[PDB]
């Protein structure tokens, strides 16, 4: 149950820092703010590392063996991670702002640019155990005068080429014996050297600067002493160079400028191979594959990530996230993609397993407040601040209905009928609940009776009653259908935000501004029980506020809650950085998760460092934005009293940490929470956490495989269930033969039935034994499918992942073979004569 680990981070493909490819250019490592996401683009799946920096990260590398990673944030706090175990080895604090870190090609060293010092360290072994201090220093080189902007190793790990903000670029040798091979600096530039690269045979050096020159350096005579033989210029006037890379095997210089435009050149010739644009924001990052066939770009401002093959001109992916803007989320009816409604006005359908956005929808002129699915995965209704509830058909990707009121008010919550006849939506400035029909697009009625803004709505999925809840401390139950027109008010203690309905529609749990969760029966409208939830909340102290976190009244309540799909738990979160999940029958806290440990966000620390408080204000309230290098981020475009508007540059304050919507997954034991860093996705995996179920002294792994070898298959399977080890359940499940699948499946006891159903679900999504798993499913449903029917909500998140296996892999396979059957029949039954 309650041992949810951090699994994934949907949204925000890229935030800040350098993009890296793997050695086999399959995965790309992209910095989300303090995490690191790894997208495998071939096996279409993705994860996010569980470790966390205290600030937004700025530099990334992993060595060519793919075996260990090092990530540095924007004040030098590096973290070294064992890659294939996903578990952090060491934390090392370089003391100052590190521009780039880079491993060696041969792997044994790395080198990083900390200010004006190039410092070369030697890599620890992955198979050596942990030490107190595994990093051994090779050298620290100081030749530069201002900060270093880049590193480039040679092909053989012998020389290292650093580019400085001071207008030169130096070449350094690794060992002391070749000091006289690398003693030259490369002057001649007008602005910041943004890159310095070797050619393939290391007999040319190309040095590209900020203003748009690229110099070619060769070892000739006018002895031989590293002349510059040629200068090429990009001639981009208002734009200037932001990130360069060079793949020397295929001779490819990729440059990304400060106007979105990337041009890529073939370098000793300097011929424009291609030139196009990511967008309008500057291109902060370029990286190239190891074969040089893929290029990955990143623009930090809208947070967008490209990888683009350039031989074929075709975007491998062109994605874009959302920082500090997600007003809601909703899982699909098969919990395979999350639909996210975001403040810049758009809906995005994020695939979960591969972390990329499938479709996006922008027909709202202003911010979208709420998204909710309907008609079982066909339509998706969304209500917005421009005064529209509009329906989206996810089959033809169209907006087929737009519902407006006659009053032009901005809707802040919506709720759809089960059989999607009726859509209701409630505002934060009108006190009515607008009820439109979906077939005829008209306004069916307007339910009045609240005396405060309708904060949250829901429709009961079974008996179709409408539970609304508003800031007049009142929840209110409307029987709309069938001659009644009945209203039932329930008073509560303080003003309700976040109502959620039980899955079977018997009960409804509200959150209140006291920070309590009150669970009401609907039919006899009494309080079945409350949870006191204001002391188990982590409310941080902001940098600008003058009152402690113990005394702050800002975020000690939950503004969004969701029941579990069996109806026994509640996940909840708000404008604080703790998401808490409770179980309702005992009314106790199961677990409380910290949504972020970033200090670049605001409401994180409860206790701020008193070294930053000075004799005039904190030191994180001084705007050091006039010390910036260039005008486009020296500009202060933050018009004054703006909270939650648009465009994060127009706010002047650090982004607060907050959760706007939580959801339990309809198929597999997970929840998702829409934080500011992204859609945090938490789930339990059962490869770890030995959690047996009434075993005894004689039930063992060896005893299970002995009963399997002496082929009592029912005994072996229920011994595997009692151990509750997933590899044992898998091993016995594949050792049972097909003739006595239906005997075993009829004789599994009634308590181990949801175990085998959820195992077959989360196994058969990915495993290749399609006919075996459908044999098991047919045996189990024919054997005990009356028990499932009458214990519906027990098997409601296990049977719903079974028909995420049937309709999404098995029915697709059947569609392909049915196409082959009818093409065969037509191609051999007719007459193609002349």
């Amino acid at each position: 149950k309650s041992d949810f680990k951090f699994s994934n981070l949907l949204g925000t493909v890229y935030r800040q820092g350098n993009i890296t490819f793997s050695d086999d250019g399959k995965q790309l490592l992209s910095p989300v703010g303090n995490r690191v996401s790894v997208f495998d683009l071939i096996n279409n799946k993705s994860f996010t590392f569980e470790y966390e920096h205290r600030k937004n990260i700025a530099a990334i590398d992993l060595n060519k063996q793919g075996t260990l990673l090092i990530s540095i944030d924007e004040d030098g706090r590096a973290i070294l991670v064992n890659f294939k175990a996903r578990n952090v080895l060491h934390h090392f604090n370089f003391k100052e702002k590190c521009s780039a870190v880079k491993f060696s090609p041969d792997g044994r060293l790395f080198a990083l640019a900390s200010g004006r010092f190039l410092q070369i360290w030697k890599t620890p072994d992955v198979n050596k155990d942990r030490q107190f201090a595994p990093f051994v220093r090779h050298r620290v080189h100081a030749g530069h005068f201002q900060d270093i902007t880049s590193l480039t190793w040679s092909q053989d790990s012998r020389f290292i080429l650093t580019t400085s903000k001071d207008l030169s670029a130096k070449i350094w040798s690794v060992d002391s014996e070749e000091k006289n091979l690398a003693a030259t600096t490369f002057n001649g530039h007008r602005d910041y050297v943004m890159g310095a690269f070797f050619s393939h045979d290391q007999e040319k050096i190309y040095t590209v600067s900020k203003d748009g020159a690229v110099f070619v350096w060769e070892f000739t005579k006018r002895k031989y002493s590293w002349r510059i033989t040629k200068k090429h210029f990009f001639y981009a006037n208002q734009a200037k160079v932001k990130c360069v890379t060079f793949h020397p095997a295929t001779r490819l210089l990729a440059v990304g400028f400060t106007s979105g435009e990337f041009r890529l050149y073939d370098l000793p010739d300097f011929t424009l191979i291609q030139q196009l644009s990511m967008g309008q924001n500057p291109v902060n990052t370029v990286s190239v594959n190891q074969t040089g066939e893929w290029l990955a770009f990143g623009s930090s401002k809208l947070g967008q990530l490209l990888v683009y093959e350039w031989q074929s001109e075709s975007y491998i992916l062109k994605q874009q996230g959302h920082f500090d803007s997600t007003n809601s989320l909703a899982y699909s009816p098969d919990g395979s993609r999350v639909v996210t409604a975001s403040e810049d006005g758009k809906i995005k359908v994020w695939d979960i397993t591969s972390g990329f956005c499938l479709a996006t929808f922008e027909e709202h002129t202003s911010s979208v407040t709420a998204v909710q699915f309907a008609k079982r995965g066909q339509v998706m209704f969304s209500s917005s601040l421009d005064g529209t509830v509009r329906a989206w058909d996810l089959i033809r990707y169209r907006n087929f209905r737009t519902f407006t009121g006659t009053e032009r008010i901005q809707f802040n919550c919506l709720a759809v009928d089960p059989s999607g006849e009726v859509v209701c939506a409630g505002s934060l400035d009108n006190f009515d609940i607008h009820v439109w029909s979906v077939q005829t697009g008209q306004l069916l009625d307007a339910l009045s009776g609240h005396e405060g803004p309708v904060s949250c709505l829901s429709f009961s999925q079974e008996n179709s009653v409408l539970a609304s809840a508003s800031w007049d401390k009142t929840i209110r139950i409307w029987s709309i259908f069938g001659r009644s027109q009945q209203v039932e008010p329930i008073e509560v203690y303080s003003d309700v935000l976040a109502l959620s309905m039980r899955p079977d529609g018997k009960e409804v749990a509200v959150s209140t501004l006291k920070g309590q969760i009150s669970i009401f029966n609907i039919e006899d409208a009494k309080q079945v029980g409350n949870i006191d939830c204001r002391k188990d909340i982590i409310s941080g102290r902001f940098n600008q506020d003058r009152f402690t976190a113990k005394n702050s009244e800002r975020s000690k309540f939950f503004t969004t809650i969701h029941y579990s799909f069996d109806g026994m738990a509640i996940v909840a979160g708000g404008n604080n950085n703790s998401i808490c999940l409770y179980d309702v029958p005992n009314e106790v806290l199961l677990k409380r998760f910290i949504v972020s440990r970033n200090m670049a966000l605001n409401g994180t620390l409860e206790f701020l460092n008193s070294k930053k408080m000075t004799e005039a204000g904190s030191l994180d309230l001084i705007d050091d934005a006039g010390e910036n290098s260039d005008l486009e981020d020296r500009i202060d475009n933050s018009l004054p009293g703006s909270q939650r508007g648009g465009d994060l540059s127009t706010r002047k304050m650090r982004p607060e940490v907050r959760v706007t919507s939580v959801q339990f997954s309809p198929t597999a034991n997970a929840f998702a929470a829409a934080s500011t860093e992204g859609l945090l996705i938490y789930s339990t995996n059962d490869t770890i956490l030995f959690d047996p179920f009434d075993l005894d002294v004689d039930v063992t792994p060896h005893s299970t495989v002995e009963a399997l070898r002496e082929k009592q298959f029912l005994n072996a399977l229920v011994m595997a269930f009692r151990l509750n080890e997933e590899y044992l359940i898998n091993k016995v499940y594949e050792a049972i033969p097909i003739k006595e699948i239906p005997l075993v499946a009829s004789n599994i006891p009634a308590i181990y039935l949801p175990r085998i159903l959820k195992f077959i679900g989360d196994f058969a999504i990915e495993s290749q034994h399609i006919e075996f798993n459908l044999i098991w499913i047919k045996a189990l449903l024919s054997a005990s499918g009356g028990y499932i029917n009458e214990h519906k909500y027990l098997f409601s998140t296990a049977m719903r992942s079974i028909q995420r296996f049937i309709v999404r892999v098995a029915k697709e396979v059947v569609n392909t073979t049915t196409d082959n059957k009818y093409t065969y029949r037509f191609l051999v039954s007719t007459d193609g004569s002349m």
Binding site: L167, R190, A616, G617, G626, L631, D636
Partner: protein, 166 residues
């Protein structure tokens, strides 16, 4: 932050300007500080005007003029991004150059922008005053020093001093 130090024209007063926000006008040989103000934006340079009584600070963008005890007297709408301030004390002109490529003279007595001059060489990297004739030498990113006067809209002289910037 890093403190830009300016004295008065006699040796009496000192005016320090921290890079984070901290400006202070003081008598450095008494122990008398007579203005101390933490303007929370990144101040760059500061000068006195004609006494210890008025001092001009080059803040995040706008140049401000404060009086003896630190009260704000003026916010210069021109002088868009000063980095280098200076004062011509016989002529009563506050001279200003910065990240705009413009050199501006502000007559301090009457309160009137005497000249805006396009340097036309990008941001100004160094700036000094020739105390003998009050022509201002600027130093650009070409390694070009350029001698300016508020009468002529061009430099009186252009010297090729260095490579790189100055």
């Amino acid at each position: 932050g890093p403190y830009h130090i300016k004295y008065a024209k006699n040796g009496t007063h000192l005016l320090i300007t921290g890079r984070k926000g901290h400006v202070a006008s003081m008598d450095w040989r008494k122990g008398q500080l007579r203005a101390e103000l933490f303007l929370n934006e990144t101040c760059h340079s500061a000068t006195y005007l004609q006494n210890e009584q008025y001092f001009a600070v080059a803040q995040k963008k706008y140049t401000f003029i404060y009086d003896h005890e630190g009260t704000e007297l003026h916010r210069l709408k021109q002088h868009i991004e000063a980095r280098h301030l200076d004062f011509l004390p016989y002529h009563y002109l506050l001279v200003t150059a910065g990240e705009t490529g413009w050199l501006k003279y502000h007559d301090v007595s009457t309160g009137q922008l005497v000249s805006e001059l396009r340097t036309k060489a990008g941001p100004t990297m160094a700036m000094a005053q020739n105390p003998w004739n009050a022509v201002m030498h600027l130093g650009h990113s070409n390694g070009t020093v350029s001698l300016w006067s508020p009468s002529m809209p061009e430099p009186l002289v252009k010297l090729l001093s260095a490579r790189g910037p100055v």
